[PDB]
RNA sequence: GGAAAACUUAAAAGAACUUUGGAAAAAGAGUGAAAAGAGCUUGAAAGAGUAAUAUGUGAACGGAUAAUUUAUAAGAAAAAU
RNA sequence: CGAGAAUAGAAACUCUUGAAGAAGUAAAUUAUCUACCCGUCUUGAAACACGGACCAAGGAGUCUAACAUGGAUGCGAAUGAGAAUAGCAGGAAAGCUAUAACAUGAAGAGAAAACGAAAAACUAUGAGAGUGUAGAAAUACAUUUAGCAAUAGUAUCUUUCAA
RNA sequence: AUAAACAUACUUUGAAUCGGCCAAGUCUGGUAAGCAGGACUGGCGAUGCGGGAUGAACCGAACGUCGAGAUAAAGUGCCAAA
RNA sequence: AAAAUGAAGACAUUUUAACGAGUAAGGAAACGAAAUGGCGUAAGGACAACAAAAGUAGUAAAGAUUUAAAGUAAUUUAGAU
């Protein structure tokens, strides 16, 4: 079972003048210029972040598989959504090292959680092995 | 914890004082362990390295023993014979060796650490009589009010005490009420969670009694 | 006010000391969040030393 | 009683002397005091008596 | 309110820090109890 | 540099937003400046009757 | 806490919450109380409106220890003993022993008859008294008594 | 569009208790529940009550006590405020709820033969409010204000915040 | 008994806690996907409701 | 009056011999855990060079909607009596 | 013929496509529609009005002192006394303790001398609490009592030539 | 008569602002002015959207993100939907 | 906004209804039915494997370059080098 996840806008809210400067990073800043083309809404640049774009309160912060983010850092974090993995996913740190991370997708598997970075900091297994 | 107002725990001061260190006081510094061998014989734990003393290394890739070529006070490092590498056109350099990673196997010893070696001998057994002075007191005191009992329970085993007697107050009802957001809903989660290894536990149990 | 009896141990035999001892009414007090939070924050201060360039 | 070693204070009383709100609301409930507990009702969607003959 | 400062003179000049109040404490004191070594009912 | 003297434009607009405040019930009801032998007579009645009423709670 | 200041919710803004026409500019009227009678004096006159000109008699060099002069109202007396010493002589009358307020040992130099008194004979000691103070005094049953 | 008088804002009324003090959070939550149930005008005065600022909480004393308490003999005076001692006249009998007692006027009650309640052993005793007396402080006696308002004026001028040389 | 949010599975000789279950005492079970009961069949001369 | 300029490595072990070249250097070889190769920890943006791909009549860039190409990416259970 | 009401009545499905890559998403290109240079003073700028070649880093409501309002806090006719200062353990720029000078307030008016507050108050409207009846689900009417806050008006009292 | 309980009455603290411009079944000075100055209202400023080809003010109508449907001003030979 | 529920769920509770343009300007923190909600930089005090070895780290930190995902956005998260 799992919800139809509908997006208002897929796009990317882009800063005003952003693709013509390389100073103007692409990263969203209300344009608060008095004669300002965007923030007086005309029409061709009218395209501002609101809160009508917000998306389902049910479907909100949900990943594509249908489950939720829960990062660990240890088998021990594992333990705080065993109750939960029809609702949750578990999500290694990035600075978690490779020894750490096989005792975490071991105990995962056994604790029936699923694992977004089962795939990740794997040894040189992929040529010749 | 230090209490000396004249000395300084600060970082950087103590580099600098090492750095600046004359002489006189890089002797000290560069400083080796004896061997079992040599430390029975003399009841000396550490001296100063000195030259054509015969050392072992024992951290490193190289466990190899030899003669001290050269002992530099400037670099805090010394040179052994056996350790050296060849400088690619064919001519061979000396390795330099931290002092602190060798130990003294055979030492070098004219006249003067004779007088060392006797003075830092004498002090090991005067420090011994001044701990076993005071470790008979604090005994002294502790049988005086636990006659029945020994000293040599402190370095045993500790039994802890298993009762559980509880206390009535009226503030735990209020325990839930006292705590913020964040550190609430951490400690029903650790409830939570340690119910269900509970739960488990229970569980597993049944299957093992079946 | 009761106030229940609180057990003394003993930290070498570990037996309870025979005689209990009432619990001091500092223990019934209100316990407020916020008027700690009021002290502390002020409190945490006064260790401070001086600086400026 | 005041405080010996500390001049001038005393510990305070809480706002309320017990710290719970069950006793209060079981006496009410004995009392028979308080309404029973109530559950909305589900409100009916707008139709169109028109053409919904229902 | 009308406001009265006299600040229009220089005031960084006539700041007095008082640093050294907690230090002052120790100095007295250790004057106060080394004149009682030194002859006792001279701080009498 | 001339400017405009004075225009009532936006000025009845402005004067309805929060709109005319109505004096209270109290504002007519003040005696200040009135009879003065009609002053004398009310105050003479009401000394009357407040010794009248003293007196009576004093009994009881 | 300069982290709940309104300069944190500001930037951004490019004019820091001052306006675009009328600029933050160095002063606003004047340094100080300037323009006290030109161009704040319909400020001066609305919330100061005596602030400007001279009023009574100069005095060179006062005593202000001459006016030190603490006062204590009758309803207030029987507090500076305390009210189990007051239920403890209620009974009393003319003949046998009855407590003596002494003011000036508490500081209070002055009595003055404000409030009502317990119906209970009093000794009350000070240096001055009104008339309604020992009016009420002496017809509770008291007596007034000076001192220095 | 729609042509409105105004927009929605938020209701200028206090719903919840100030401040994080954990007890008066409770009162709120004891007498919420009151009000909502039992349907109370009573509850739901104390309930607004409880959650006004300390500015507009002010205090009674035992002398307003004793004379508004004085053709109510068996009775329990009700005020959602801390209770002061007025040392200058007699503390009568009576049994008194409020938020805090003074030191100096609880022991004033408590000898006088009165009981110094709180507001959860009021809502356990009468919690519809049976033998009640709604009792609240003056607003008016602060020295804020005398200030307010412009001291020129012809009618009713403010007190002057005093300053540079005022005579 | 087991919780209902627990499914025991087979350690492969791995670390487990102490709460765990061995492997002895541990029958797996086969995933269900389908549960939604199958059309009915009715006699061949009467006709269907659709 | 009055600046700018910090960092190889654990250790110089700071390539060392051959071929091309007038020489500087380059290509091998070698040291080192790793060139980190002395313009030496990492190495961003502006600006270039090389490789892959795509587009084109007096500006260029952005947005909505589709098409094409490329990439990502959803499963091992199982019916009726 | 027949509403109400009473009695008996029945809905569980198909086909296509997808790990030989479905649905969606991203990038590039093309096509239709759409798109004037940002910041700024200005009634009004895309402006033939000014600054801006490009990138990185630095870059502008801060601190001290006095007052007021307001939200949380402690105590309350008191509050503070981390006024100096004097002690304690611990070695401590931190912590604790100090029947204490004083600051603000408890009393106000007058230039000053000289004074220094009750008829143990009154009137109006107002917050709350019961009882009964009824609709009948909530809730509405009648009656008894209470008079807080606030506003206004008053009698009385202190000071002033004047309230 | 009609409307009005997120009604009504406010209290305190404070920001910005007082260069304005336009239209008209209006007026005064002027030959007149996209000139100068006023009375009442609505706008622009602070405001995008559909229409007038283009336009600060004109006409319709004032804006959370969208799907479908009737519409407004105004249009229906092609650019351009009819 | 109003009803309902309420020691802890969770998505800052459930239901119903109305509303949502905007320059200068305002809406400091906290306030269970919360008197606007949040993101980011650095430093200080605590918390971070509850059975006596208790956050991550040479089985690869910070940084850099990119590929994808979450969020209306500020930004965050993870893969590869």
Redesign the pocket.
Same mark, same amino acid.
């Given at each position: 079972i799992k919800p139809k996840?509908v997006?208002?806008?897929?796009?990317?809210?882009?800063?005003?003048?952003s693709?013509?400067?390389?100073?103007?990073?692409?990263?969203?800043?209300?344009?608060?210029?008095?004669?300002?083309?965007?923030?007086?809404?005309?029409?061709?640049?009218?395209?501002?972040?609101?809160?009508?774009?917000?998306?389902?309160?049910?479907?909100?912060?949900?990943?594509?598989?249908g489950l939720?983010?829960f990062?660990v850092?240890?088998?021990?974090?594992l333990?705080m959504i065993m109750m939960?993995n029809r609702?949750y996913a578990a999500?290694?740190?990035?600075?978690?090292?490779?020894?750490?991370?096989?005792?975490i997708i071991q105990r995962a598997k056994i604790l029936n959680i699923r694992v977004?970075?089962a795939?990740?900091?794997?040894?040189k297994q992929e040529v010749a092995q | 914890?230090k209490?000396?107002?004249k000395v300084s725990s600060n970082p950087s001061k103590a580099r600098k004082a090492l750095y600046t260190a004359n002489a006189s006081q890089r002797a000290l510094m560069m400083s080796a362990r004896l061997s079992k061998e040599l430390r029975e014989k003399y009841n000396v734990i550490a001296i100063p390295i000195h030259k054509d003393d015969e050392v072992k290394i024992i951290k490193?890739?190289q466990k190899v023993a030899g003669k001290v070529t050269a002992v530099r006070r400037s670099?805090y490092?010394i040179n052994i014979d056996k350790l050296t590498?060849?400088?690619?056109?064919?001519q061979t *350099?000396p390795?330099?060796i931290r002092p602190s990673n060798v130990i003294i196997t055979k030492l070098f010893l004219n006249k003067d650490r004779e007088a060392l070696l006797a003075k830092k001998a004498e002090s090991r057994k005067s420090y011994k009589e001044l701990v076993a002075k005071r470790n008979e007191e604090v005994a002294k005191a502790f049988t005086a009010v636990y006659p029945a009992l020994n000293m040599d329970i402190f370095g045993k085993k *500790?039994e802890?005490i298993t009762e559980k007697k509880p206390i009535r107050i009226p503030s735990k009802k209020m325990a839930?009420?006292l705590?913020?957001?964040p550190?609430?809903?951490?400690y029903?989660?650790?409830?939570?969670?340690?119910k269900a290894?509970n739960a488990i536990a229970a569980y597993k149990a049944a299957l093992a009694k079946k | 006010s009761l106030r229940p009896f609180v057990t003394i141990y003993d930290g070498i035999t570990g037996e309870a000391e025979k005689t209990p001892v009432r619990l001091p009414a500092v223990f019934l007090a209100?316990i407020?969040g916020?008027?700690v939070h009021?002290?502390y924050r002020?409190?945490?201060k006064?260790?401070?030393?001086?600086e400026g360039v | 009683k005041?405080?010996?070693?500390?001049?001038?204070?005393?510990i305070?009383?809480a706002?309320m002397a017990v710290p719970d709100?069950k006793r209060v609301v079981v006496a009410a409930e004995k009392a028979k005091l308080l309404?029973?507990?109530?559950?909305?009702?589900?409100?009916p969607?707008?139709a169109n008596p028109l053409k919904n003959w229902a | 309110?009308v406001?009265?400062?006299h600040?229009c003179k220089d005031?960084r000049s006539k700041?007095h820090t008082?640093?050294?109040?907690?230090?002052?404490?120790?100095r007295?004191?250790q004057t106060?109890?080394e004149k009682a070594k030194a002859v006792f009912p001279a701080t009498i | 540099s001339?400017?405009?003297?004075?225009?009532?434009?936006?000025?009845?607009?402005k004067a309805h937003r929060?709109?005319f405040?109505?004096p209270?019930?109290?504002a007519y009801?003040?005696?200040?400046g009135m009879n003065v032998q009609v002053?004398k007579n009310?105050?003479a009645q009401?000394?009357f009757?407040?010794?009248k009423?003293?007196?009576a709670?004093?009994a009881a | 806490?300069?982290?709940?200041?309104?300069?944190?919710?500001?930037?951004g803004?490019?004019?820091?919450?001052?306006?675009?026409?009328?600029?933050?500019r160095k002063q606003r009227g004047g340094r100080g109380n300037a323009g006290g009678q030109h161009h704040r004096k319909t400020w001066f006159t609305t919330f100061h409106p005596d602030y400007f000109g001279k009023?009574?008699?100069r005095?060179f060099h006062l005593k202000a220890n001459?006016?030190y002069?603490?006062?204590?109202?009758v309803?207030?007396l029987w507090?500076l003993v305390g009210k189990d010493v007051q239920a403890q002589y209620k009974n009393a009358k003319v003949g046998e022993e009855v407590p003596v307020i002494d003011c000036v040992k508490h500081?209070?130099?002055?009595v003055?008859?404000?409030?009502?008194?317990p119906?209970q004979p009093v000794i009350v000691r000070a240096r001055?008294?009104?008339?309604?103070?020992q009016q009420?005094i002496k017809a509770?049953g008291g007596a007034c008594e000076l001192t220095a | 569009?729609?042509?409105?008088?105004?927009?929605?804002?938020?209701?200028?009324?206090?719903?919840?208790?100030?401040?994080?003090?954990?007890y008066?959070?409770?009162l709120?939550?004891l007498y919420?529940?009151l009000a909502?149930?039992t349907?109370?005008?009573?509850?739901?005065?104390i309930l607004h009550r409880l /959650?006004?600022?300390?500015?507009?909480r002010?205090?009674?004393?035992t002398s307003?006590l004793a /004379?508004?308490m004085?053709?109510?003999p068996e009775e329990t005076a009700? /005020?959602v405020?801390?209770?002061?001692?007025?040392?200058r006249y007699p503390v009568p009998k009576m049994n008194v709820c409020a938020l805090?007692?003074?030191?100096?006027?609880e022991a004033a009650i408590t000898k006088a033969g009165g009981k110094c309640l709180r507001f959860d052993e009021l809502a356990l005793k009468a919690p519809?409010?049976?033998?009640?007396?709604?009792?609240?402080?003056?607003?008016?006696?602060?020295?804020?204000?005398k200030?307010?308002?412009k001291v020129c004026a012809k009618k009713?001028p403010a007190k002057q915040?005093?300053?540079k040389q005022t005579? | 008994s087991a919780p209902q949010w627990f499914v025991p599975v087979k350690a492969g000789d791995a670390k487990v806690?102490?709460?765990y279950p061995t492997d002895d005492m541990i029958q797996e079970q086969?995933?269900?996907?389908?549960?939604r009961?199958?059309?009915?069949?009715?006699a061949l001369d009467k006709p269907?409701?659709?």
């Amino acid at each position: 079972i799992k919800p139809k996840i509908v997006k208002k806008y897929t796009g990317h809210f882009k800063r005003f003048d952003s693709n013509r400067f390389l100073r103007v990073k692409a990263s969203w800043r209300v344009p608060r210029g008095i004669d300002n083309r965007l923030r007086r809404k005309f029409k061709g640049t009218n395209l501002l972040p609101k809160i009508g774009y917000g998306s389902a309160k049910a479907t909100r912060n949900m990943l594509p598989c249908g489950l939720y983010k829960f990062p660990v850092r240890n088998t021990t974090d594992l333990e705080m959504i065993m109750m939960q993995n029809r609702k949750y996913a578990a999500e290694i740190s990035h600075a978690v090292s490779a020894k750490k991370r096989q005792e975490i997708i071991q105990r995962a598997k056994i604790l029936n959680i699923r694992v977004l970075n089962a795939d990740a900091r794997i040894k040189k297994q992929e040529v010749a092995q | 914890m230090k209490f000396n107002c004249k000395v300084s725990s600060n970082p950087s001061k103590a580099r600098k004082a090492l750095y600046t260190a004359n002489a006189s006081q890089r002797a000290l510094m560069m400083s080796a362990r004896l061997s079992k061998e040599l430390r029975e014989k003399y009841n000396v734990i550490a001296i100063p390295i000195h030259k054509d003393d015969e050392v072992k290394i024992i951290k490193g890739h190289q466990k190899v023993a030899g003669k001290v070529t050269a002992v530099r006070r400037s670099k805090y490092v010394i040179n052994i014979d056996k350790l050296t590498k060849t400088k690619a056109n064919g001519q061979t *350099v000396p390795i330099a060796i931290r002092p602190s990673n060798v130990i003294i196997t055979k030492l070098f010893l004219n006249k003067d650490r004779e007088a060392l070696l006797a003075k830092k001998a004498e002090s090991r057994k005067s420090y011994k009589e001044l701990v076993a002075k005071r470790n008979e007191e604090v005994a002294k005191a502790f049988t005086a009010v636990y006659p029945a009992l020994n000293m040599d329970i402190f370095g045993k085993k *500790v039994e802890p005490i298993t009762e559980k007697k509880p206390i009535r107050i009226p503030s735990k009802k209020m325990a839930e009420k006292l705590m913020s957001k964040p550190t609430l809903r951490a400690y029903k989660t650790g409830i939570k969670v340690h119910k269900a290894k509970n739960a488990i536990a229970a569980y597993k149990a049944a299957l093992a009694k079946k | 006010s009761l106030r229940p009896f609180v057990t003394i141990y003993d930290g070498i035999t570990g037996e309870a000391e025979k005689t209990p001892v009432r619990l001091p009414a500092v223990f019934l007090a209100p316990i407020r969040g916020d008027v700690v939070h009021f002290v502390y924050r002020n409190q945490s201060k006064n260790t401070r030393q001086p600086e400026g360039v | 009683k005041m405080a010996q070693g500390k001049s001038g204070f005393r510990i305070a009383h809480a706002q309320m002397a017990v710290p719970d709100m069950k006793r209060v609301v079981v006496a009410a409930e004995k009392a028979k005091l308080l309404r029973a507990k109530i559950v909305l009702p589900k409100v009916p969607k707008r139709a169109n008596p028109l053409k919904n003959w229902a | 309110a009308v406001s009265n400062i006299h600040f229009c003179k220089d005031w960084r000049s006539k700041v007095h820090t008082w640093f050294k109040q907690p230090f002052r404490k120790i100095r007295r004191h250790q004057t106060r109890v080394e004149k009682a070594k030194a002859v006792f009912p001279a701080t009498i | 540099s001339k400017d405009k003297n004075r225009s009532s434009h936006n000025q009845s607009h402005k004067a309805h937003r929060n709109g005319f405040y109505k004096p209270k019930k109290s504002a007519y009801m003040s005696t200040k400046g009135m009879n003065v032998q009609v002053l004398k007579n009310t105050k003479a009645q009401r000394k009357f009757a407040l010794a009248k009423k003293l007196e009576a709670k004093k009994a009881a | 806490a300069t982290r709940f200041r309104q300069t944190r919710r500001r930037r951004g803004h490019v004019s820091m919450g001052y306006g675009r026409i009328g600029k933050h500019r160095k002063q606003r009227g004047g340094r100080g109380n300037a323009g006290g009678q030109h161009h704040r004096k319909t400020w001066f006159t609305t919330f100061h409106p005596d602030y400007f000109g001279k009023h009574g008699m100069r005095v060179f060099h006062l005593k202000a220890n001459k006016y030190y002069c603490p006062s204590i109202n009758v309803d207030s007396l029987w507090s500076l003993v305390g009210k189990d010493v007051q239920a403890q002589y209620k009974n009393a009358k003319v003949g046998e022993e009855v407590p003596v307020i002494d003011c000036v040992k508490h500081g209070y130099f002055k009595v003055l008859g404000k409030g009502f008194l317990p119906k209970q004979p009093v000794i009350v000691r000070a240096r001055y008294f009104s008339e309604k103070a020992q009016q009420k005094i002496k017809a509770v049953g008291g007596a007034c008594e000076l001192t220095a | 569009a729609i042509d409105l008088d105004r927009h929605h804002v938020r209701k200028h009324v206090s719903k919840t208790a100030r401040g994080n003090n954990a007890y008066m959070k409770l009162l709120v939550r004891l007498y919420g529940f009151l009000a909502r149930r039992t349907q109370s005008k009573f509850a739901k005065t104390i309930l607004h009550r409880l /959650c006004l600022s300390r500015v507009n909480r002010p205090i009674v004393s035992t002398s307003k006590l004793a /004379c508004l308490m004085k053709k109510h003999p068996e009775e329990t005076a009700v /005020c959602v405020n801390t209770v002061t001692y007025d040392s200058r006249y007699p503390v009568p009998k009576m049994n008194v709820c409020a938020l805090k007692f003074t030191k100096t006027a609880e022991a004033a009650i408590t000898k006088a033969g009165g009981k110094c309640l709180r507001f959860d052993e009021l809502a356990l005793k009468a919690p519809t409010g049976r033998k009640t007396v709604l009792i609240r402080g003056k607003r008016n006696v602060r020295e804020a204000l005398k200030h307010f308002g412009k001291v020129c004026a012809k009618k009713n001028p403010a007190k002057q915040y005093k300053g540079k040389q005022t005579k | 008994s087991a919780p209902q949010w627990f499914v025991p599975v087979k350690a492969g000789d791995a670390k487990v806690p102490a709460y765990y279950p061995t492997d002895d005492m541990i029958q797996e079970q086969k995933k269900k996907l389908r549960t939604r009961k199958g059309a009915k069949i009715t006699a061949l001369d009467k006709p269907a409701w659709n």
